[PDB]
Structure 1
Amino acid sequence: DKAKKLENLLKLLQLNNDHKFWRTQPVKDFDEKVVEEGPIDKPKTPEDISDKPLPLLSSFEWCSIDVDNKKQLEDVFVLLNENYVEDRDAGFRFNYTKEFFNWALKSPGWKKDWHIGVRVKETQKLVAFISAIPVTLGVRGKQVPSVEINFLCVHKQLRSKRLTPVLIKEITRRVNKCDIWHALYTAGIVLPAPVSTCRYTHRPLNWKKLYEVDFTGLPDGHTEEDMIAENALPAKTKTAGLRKLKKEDIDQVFELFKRYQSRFELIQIFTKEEFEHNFIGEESLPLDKQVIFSYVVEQPDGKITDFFSFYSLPFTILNNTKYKDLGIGYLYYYATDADFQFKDRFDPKATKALKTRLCELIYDACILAKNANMDVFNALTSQDNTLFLDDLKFGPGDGFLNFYLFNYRAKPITGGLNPDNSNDIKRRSNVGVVML
């Protein structure tokens, strides 16, 4: 009742072109002011959770999807490509590729029984999918051993069946019996537990095509030409001593990364096993299939100054004769030392120093992205993005990531957003983890 008032205002600020499940879950309520951070449930142990499949309706069965298995992995990225978009007439479909899930679902500690799904009894048609992955989080100072949930899907025909809860309850059951009792999840929708909210953004890499596909618009009193001239990128990258990410660099970067990253209230703590895996893709993939692109700067001697990364996630375009596909390059994790010889992160000179470097690197991330035959480069106002987003012509994008923490309460973490939904250039963000 007094929880809905605060909720509506949250949806209202996220306005853009009752909850009888989470009601019964360990999630921070809207009106809940957190005095002390930590778990919500009384600490349980494996033996309190039964190993039995949760009752689905008639005609459905549970199923683990082995990623390594060609057959099953297809059933996943087929269900996703066709249903993971709300509107049928949108003009765009998601394009999850065998290369993508072999990167995103194959992380150190990945259990095949943790890549959950629902199939039909008679047909074997995969009509649901919610997977997870084991990680440790850095929820404001404390270390939280948890699991990242992503890629939730229910087949479009079976929407409003309250089957989502069941798919959560089950993935909760399967994780809990492994001595892992928390989670981090992100969604576009508003739910009881928002620890932070971030806004999406767009750097137009191929404006022409983006405008010819209805994915961006023409501003008033502006020529089509004017926009093409505005977003005109060069062909070659500018910052000296820049190259790709070899294995030889790993030990040097890993440190530089978590060193830089230990400034965000919420982070995912990396091990050199899951770090190599996240930032190096399959041995030899062609440019049109390659998933993750990581770049680094080697100082003449051999020192590593700064690194960045980004991942391709393409759309398939429908009703358009000229174009059949649209390339999207999402900004991922990055590090830099330009603000290391300073004592305060919010020091004016140290902010300038972090800025003019982040501007250099990300501008180059854009070029290298355009070169990777992508059409738009995406960012999140999370991390230290706010320093460059305005400058680098990253247009304001309608759409908000709401960050949630299952079975754990924490104070609001800056998400790079001012009261009125503008980029917070003075405070930036303490959100350091990037979800897909």
Structure 2
Amino acid sequence: DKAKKLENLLKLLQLNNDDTSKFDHKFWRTQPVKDFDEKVVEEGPIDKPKTPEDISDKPLPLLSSFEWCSIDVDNKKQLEDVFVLLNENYVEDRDAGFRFNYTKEFFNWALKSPGWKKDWHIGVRVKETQKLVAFISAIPVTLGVRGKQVPSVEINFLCVHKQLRSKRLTPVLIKEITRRVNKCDIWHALYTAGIVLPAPVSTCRYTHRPLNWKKLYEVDFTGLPDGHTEEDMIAENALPAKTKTAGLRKLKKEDIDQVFELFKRYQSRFELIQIFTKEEFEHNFIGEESLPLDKQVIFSYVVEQPDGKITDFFSFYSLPFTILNNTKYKDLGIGYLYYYATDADFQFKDRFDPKATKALKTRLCELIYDACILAKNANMDVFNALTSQDNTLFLDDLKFGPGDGFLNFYLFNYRAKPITGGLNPDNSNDIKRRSNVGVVML
């Protein structure tokens, strides 16, 4: 009642002409989640503490015709099954012009994270045919939620085949993967969606830096502004071929220890983060051995000083679209800004000091300017960033356009207060406060 009131208001805040994928609440009403009207007095779990023994080993009943299944990443045939199911179904509109293009290379990187368990890469198949019709994945991480060590799981890649959509099969998937994670002494999750569900702990906005404006326009992924020319836009978004900041090079393995310190030192300013083990850190920021440029997933760069000191670190991952109804172009290169760290504001006591901000800003501008060059050179056509972290320092100056897509962050079975998503009351970039959202989901 005051739940629906505040939900409609939340939906109105986020109203737009769904860009990409975007889908009274009988399922979540029965779930360990913050409700909209609920003010949080103290942060912590929602359910009374439990043990694996209160949770059964028998998987939840599916309707007649279906069956569960693990997916072994390493098993080509099975892996392929996932990205076929995704690519064909992961975009609402069938004739939208674009399709997701999840590669084997990509899921090998994302789904094989330290502690990954094939039983957490869940699927559903038709009994008779063995057709994979639904998928959800879980991966282990300890989250940092305002100083508190939360041992949790990251749910991503929920997908249900379009032909049997709206069949309340999503609850079953969720319950079942909750079951499998509860049965291993994990009681929380971090999930993000573009859709508004009961527990938005945060909200950020997608933005786009054009790297190849001409192609972007020819594919209808960007507009031609009023009183402006095609050439004008080309000229406006023109990037140099070579990066500008001295010291810049790829992230070698030998850098892990020095970077990992700089990263958790830097990251420890945000209220919601993932606490990285040197193991999982190394896995995220160095991809499969020698992939070609059109298959490489994670791009990580560092700034080495003459004396060998590592000062800065930024990363980005590729996730291409397939472009359908278009004679000139078959696909669209998409870079996403990932995790980064810099020591440029370290010699300052307060993050929000006008001087500490000025310093951090002109550095982030330098680094992310180069990230763009690098991405363009990696043959990407557009560069996405999320108003999260300290992103709001450079988004505008670096010609990151406003993008009509919102990302809400959620915590399962845990209540936390609103965390700055880098947005103002009116959805413009909060350049004064920036964001305390430290995690970057896929």
The one of 306, 314, 322 aligned to 1:316: 322
Aligned partners of 2:179, 2:59: CA distance in 1, in Å?
9
- Give per-residue Cα distances to partners, 1:196-249, cap 9 Å, x unaligned: 000000000000000000000000000110000000000000000100000000
What is residue 355 of structure 1 aligned with on the other side?
361
Cα deviation for residue 394 of structure 1 reads 0.3
What is residue 21 of structure 2 aligned with on the other side?
none
Cα deviation for residue 262 of structure 1 reads 0.1
What is residue 210 of structure 1 aligned with on the other side?
216
Cα deviation for residue 13 of structure 1 reads 0.7
- Give per-residue Cα distances to partners, 1:42-99, cap 9 Å, x unaligned: 0010000000010100100000000000110000000000000000010000000000
Q: Secondary structure at the match of 2:57?
A: coil
Aligned partners of 2:65, 2:421: CA distance in 1, in Å?
43
What is residue 20 of structure 2 aligned with on the other side?
none
- Give per-residue Cα distances to partners, 1:124-169, cap 9 Å, x unaligned: 0000000110000000110100000000000001110000000000
Cα deviation for residue 309 of structure 1 reads 0.1
Which ranges of structure 2 fall in alignment gaps of 5 or more residues?
18-23
Cα deviation for residue 123 of structure 1 reads 0.4
Pairwise mapping of residues 21-420 of structure 1 onto structure 2 (< 5 A)?
A: 21-420=27-426
Quick one: percent identity of the two aligned structures? 100
Cα deviation for residue 2 of structure 1 reads 1.3
- Give per-residue Cα distances to partners, 1:175-216, cap 9 Å, x unaligned: 000000000000000000000000000000000000000000
Aligned partners of 1:106, 1:136: CA distance in 2, in Å?
16
- Give per-residue Cα distances to partners, 1:284-325, cap 9 Å, x unaligned: 000000000000000001000000000000000000000000
Aligned partners of 1:50, 1:19: CA distance in 2, in Å?
26
Aligned partners of 1:161, 1:359: CA distance in 2, in Å?
47
- Give per-residue Cα distances to partners, 1:397-432, cap 9 Å, x unaligned: 000000000000000000000000000000000000
Aligned residues: 436
Q: Secondary structure at the match of 1:373?
A: coil
Aligned partners of 1:218, 1:39: CA distance in 2, in Å?
49
- Give per-residue Cα distances to partners, 1:354-387, cap 9 Å, x unaligned: 0000000000000000000000000000000000
Aligned partners of 1:136, 1:275: CA distance in 2, in Å?
13
Q: Secondary structure at the match of 2:45?
A: coil
Aligned partners of 1:405, 1:243: CA distance in 2, in Å?
36
Aligned partners of 1:277, 1:352: CA distance in 2, in Å?
33
Q: Secondary structure at the match of 1:133?
A: strand
Q: Secondary structure at the match of 1:157?
A: helix
Aligned partners of 1:260, 1:158: CA distance in 2, in Å?
45
Cα deviation for residue 103 of structure 1 reads 0.2
Aligned partners of 2:374, 2:124: CA distance in 1, in Å?
39
Q: CA RMSD in A?
A: 0.3
Q: Secondary structure at the match of 1:236?
A: coil
Q: Secondary structure at the match of 1:377?
A: strand
Q: Secondary structure at the match of 1:138?
A: strand
Cα deviation for residue 327 of structure 1 reads 0.3
TM-score (normalizing by structure 1): 1.00
Aligned partners of 1:422, 1:26: CA distance in 2, in Å?
32
